[PDB]
Design a protein around this ligand. Sequence first.
Ligand SMILES: C[S@@+](CC[C@H](N)C(=O)[O-])C[C@H]1O[C@@H](n2cnc3c(N)ncnc32)[C@H](O)[C@@H]1O
Ligand code: SF4
Length: 359
Amino acid sequence: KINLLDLNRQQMREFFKDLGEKPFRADQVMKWMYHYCCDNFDEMTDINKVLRGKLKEVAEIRAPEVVEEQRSSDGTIKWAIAVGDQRVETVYIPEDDRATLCVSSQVGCALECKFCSTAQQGFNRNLRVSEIIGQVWRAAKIVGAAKVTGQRPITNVVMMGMGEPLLNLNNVVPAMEIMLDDFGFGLSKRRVTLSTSGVVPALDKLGDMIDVALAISLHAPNDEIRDEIVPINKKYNIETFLAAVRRYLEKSNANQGRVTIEYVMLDHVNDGTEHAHQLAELLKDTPCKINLIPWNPFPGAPYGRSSNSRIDRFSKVLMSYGFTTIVRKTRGDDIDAACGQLAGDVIDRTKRTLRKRMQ
Ligand SMILES: C[S@@+](CC[C@H](N)C(=O)[O-])C[C@H]1O[C@@H](n2cnc3c(N)ncnc32)[C@H](O)[C@@H]1O
Ligand code: SF4
């Protein structure tokens, strides 16, 4: 059966055309899928029985299942999500004015950022469209579908879970298209963010395919530091990355002219005032908003968390040059908030097989 969660609107329409149906019936089913979080054709009461029959035979709505759920006292929900025989992470971060979902792009990552827990697993495989948009679908279903509760469960999506999104463009783009779609999650392009450590030619490609808000994982003020911290910089250095960012801003207006810059704060590595002065000079040619992120520790990482006084002085230096800078709040502090940790060791895979036999 075809998983309808693999298809954007164009493809949904083409599939329904092959079923002998008019294109607007695809729109109607999408609306059921995403506005109501319906995965059951019998529940789609305004579709005729004949179409329901076709769909039950040749199609399905199969979203990844939750295998673990952690609920923070601050409202954050962290899910381990089953994708085949593997696990990825999806995180729901509520606020009064907002609700952000952090979504994974790959099982593991091949980029080897030393401060990232997902790096130490390595790269396993790319997620399919259904496995990416399906995280939004599952989260929406659990939190409460928009037309069920009368409130949009998710106002904001960030591709900031496990994996490098620019290395899964084939699947990440259609998934984001569904997020943007009126018949999908109806999100504004300003409210869908793709974060990247800087796969430069893939970023040039992204710009030709879709217009979404861009965030860059910079984490260093110069090349010698960034080579160490984020090793893809050895392939495409800061200047190459920043030039690509400028080219993207020419094609896209989701950022409203200003790229989001992510900067993780690693104790006595990239968090000094001397690093802040260098960063300020580095970014003089690129319009931006700077997010300083306290590093989230995990066992065996060769870094420490920067103290809040060191982070605050770093921020003051940046603000003295007139940069819009924001120190991000730690969310879900009472739970396993470090990216990649809840979908931990891949060796537990065999143990899961054995577990299911006893069930
Ligand atoms: C997990 S990555 C996924 C998207 C893309 N690969 C990237 O690096 O931007 C999303 C963001 O999480 C950050 N990150 C990873 N591990 C972290 C940790 N332990 N503490 C704080 N931030 C972390 C990275 O710096 C990156 O900006
Ligand atoms: S920070 Fe991003 S690019 Fe680096 S290893 Fe983690 S998921 Fe991959």
